[PDB]
Amino acid sequence: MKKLFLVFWWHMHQPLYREPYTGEYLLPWTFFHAVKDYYDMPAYLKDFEIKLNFNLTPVLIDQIQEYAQGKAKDVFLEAIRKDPDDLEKEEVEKLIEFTKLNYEKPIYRFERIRELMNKEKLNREELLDLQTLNLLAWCGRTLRKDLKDLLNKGRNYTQEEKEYVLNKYFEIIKKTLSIYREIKEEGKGSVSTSPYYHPLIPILLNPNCVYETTPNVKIPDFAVSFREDASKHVELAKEKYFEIFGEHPVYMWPPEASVSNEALELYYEKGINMLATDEVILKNSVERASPYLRYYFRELISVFFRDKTLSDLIGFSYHAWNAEDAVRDFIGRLKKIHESVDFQPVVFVVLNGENCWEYYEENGIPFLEKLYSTLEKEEWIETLTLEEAMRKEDVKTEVIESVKAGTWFDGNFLKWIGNKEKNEYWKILIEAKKKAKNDYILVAEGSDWFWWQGEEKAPFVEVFDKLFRSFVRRAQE
């Protein structure tokens, strides 16, 4: 019977928050997304008889390992752990600002949070609740079962109960890499990786590729070559992945879905057999093309183009829908795809796996449980591992010879280069590369630093600048 082949590929990444001179983690986001998403997203595979795939960047793996070993010195978590009597004013301020930053998210819907944010001054017990409810807001699906007492309590937390939550949270972190190994060993999902620090490979290989989609921009003089670094990002990622999973990775997620003819050749030369990228790149590159085929770039490497609509539905729209209606809508779209082709379509749903859930009611758990429970029971839908997608015989395929370089942001590079502020970071990087002495220059090549550059309304955005500049400084020493 004619199946629809469905492929989820959840991308997990954090830039390095660990400042190199102090060793301090200047932002807590790796901790909070580890305890909330990085274990719990693959742990859905314990309860639902489907396949789900994951990408982990090596720089994220490094940080998970440091927290699991108890070695991460996290400045914001220190303000959470302390007895409020020991908090400095600056730490209380950071606590309030962090809460206000997250205040409108449904995972922060505690009545006690509302009371605390309307009080003009907080005493010790009120600050204990503020600290503990910030922790509990980030609680993942697994511990929502075991901490139900504390969660329904909702207020009047003790220092000892807060330390108990912290202990359970670190237990989740300690099990996180093991669950990825486990679902891989069990055949329930493939795990991929990306070039080590999530750089923009097409720019490192050939900055002129930005002109293919945006010819009216100016970019700085790349007076030194980054081509060898692009190679090192891929090679070091392969080595880290082997250490964790015991194989060389044959699938990679290109950061920001970013490809070019040169980048595809590099992935081929490094032994990658398959990657995915964005539908906008497909439409920019091939006339009349469908994203439901397996493509062979120059007969060198396999490429899938994600279904942008389905991926954007989960990432941008469904957070505001009733979970039941969202799942029924999603199935109805898969039905239309299935009825619309006479071959068996391959549908790639690819997006970040940790950022959208905080905007869903109950951290996305009603939505994903309903979605996965429905998918495991649809006999005309077969969810696939990446390995199954690449080896399946009864799929339609097409050879293509050229792509227009781009990313999944509008098919171009303008969110990372081309304006005055963003170009300033590239100029800093270029001049530092000329004098670089160690691999901290590779850290500074990560895309996150250039993404935030120019952003002036984001609280904590100065922290990303402090990190970038520290890595650039350390690279030259």
Ligand X SMILES: OC[C@H]1O[C@@H]2O[C@H]3[C@H](O)[C@@H](O)[C@@H](O[C@H]4[C@H](O)[C@@H](O)[C@@H](O[C@H]5[C@H](O)[C@@H](O)[C@@H](O[C@H]6[C@H](O)[C@@H](O)[C@@H](O[C@H]7[C@H](O)[C@@H](O)[C@@H](O[C@H]8[C@H](O)[C@@H](O)[C@@H](O[C@H]1[C@H](O)[C@H]2O)O[C@@H]8CO)O[C@@H]7CO)O[C@@H]6CO)O[C@@H]5CO)O[C@@H]4CO)O[C@@H]3CO
Q: What does the binding site for ligand X look like in residue numbers (CB under 6 A)?
A: 11, 13-15, 29, 33, 101, 256, 315, 352, 354-355, 409, 447-448, 451, 458, 460
Write down the least CB distance from residue 276 to ligand X, Å.
Answer: 13
CA distance 227 to 427: 17
Handedness of CA 257, 263, 264, 266 (dihedral sign): negative
Closer of 11 and 306 to ligand X (Cβ):
11
CB 255, min distance to ligand X, A: 7
Q: 87 or 351: whose CB is closer to ligand X? A: 351
Between 128 and 234, CB nearer to ligand X:
234
Specify whether the CB–CB gap between 59 and 13 falls below 8 A. yes
Among candidate residues 343, 390, 350, the one with its CA nearest the CA of residue 3: 343
- Compute the least distance from the CB of residue 434 to ligand X, in Å: 26
Closer to ligand X by CB, 135 or 150: give it: 135
Residue whose C-alpha is closest to residue 51's, from 348, 277, 340: 348
Shorter beta-carbon distance to ligand X: residue 412 or 423: 412
- Min dist CB 288 to ligand X, Å, is 27
By beta-carbon proximity to ligand X, the closer residue of 339 and 462 is: 462
Report the distance separating Cα 210 and Cα 199, nearest Å. Answer: 15
- Minimum distance, C-beta of residue 305 to ligand X, in the bound complex (Å): 16
Which residue, 341 or 414, has its beta carbon nearer to ligand X?
414
Q: DSSP readout, 182-230?
A: HHHHTTS--EEB-STT-B-HHHHH-GGGGGGT-TT-------S--HHHH
Answer for the pair 210, 406: CB distance below 8 angstroms, yes or no: no
Q: Nearest to residue 63, comparing CAs of 111, 15, 95, 106?
A: 15
Q: How many contiguous H segments (helices) and E segments (strands) does the chain have? A: 23, 12
Burial of 341 (0-12, 13-18, 19+ CB in 10 A): middle
Q: Which amino acid is at 263?
A: A
Residue closer to ligand X by CB (options 104, 120) is: 104
Nearer to ligand X, 198 or 294 (CB): 198
User: Is 79 exposed, middle or buried (CB count within 10 Å of its CB: 0-12, 13-18, 19+)?
Assistant: buried
Q: Which helix (H) or strand (E) holds 20?
A: none
**Minimum separation from the CB atom of position 62 to ligand X (A):** 14
Report the alpha-carbon distance of residue 95 to residue 134 in Å, rounded: 9
Q: How far is the CB of 354 from ligand X (least distance, A)?
A: 6
Comparing CB distances to ligand X, the nearer of 214 and 374 is 214
Please check whether residue 198 is in contact with residue 192, taking contact to mean a CB–CB distance below 8 angstroms: no
CB proximity list for 278: less than 8 A, separation 6 or greater? 257, 305, 306, 308, 406, 407, 408, 411
- What number of residues does the chain have? 477
CB of 447 to ligand X, least distance (A): 6
Task: Write down the least CB distance from residue 118 to ligand X, Å.
Answer: 21
Do residues 344 and 5 touch, judged by C-beta distance below 8 A? yes
Q: How far is the CB of 105 from ligand X (least distance, A)?
A: 7
Q: Quick one: 48 or 330, whose CB is closer to ligand X? A: 330
Instruction: In angstroms, give the least distance from the CB of 226 to ligand X.
Output: 19
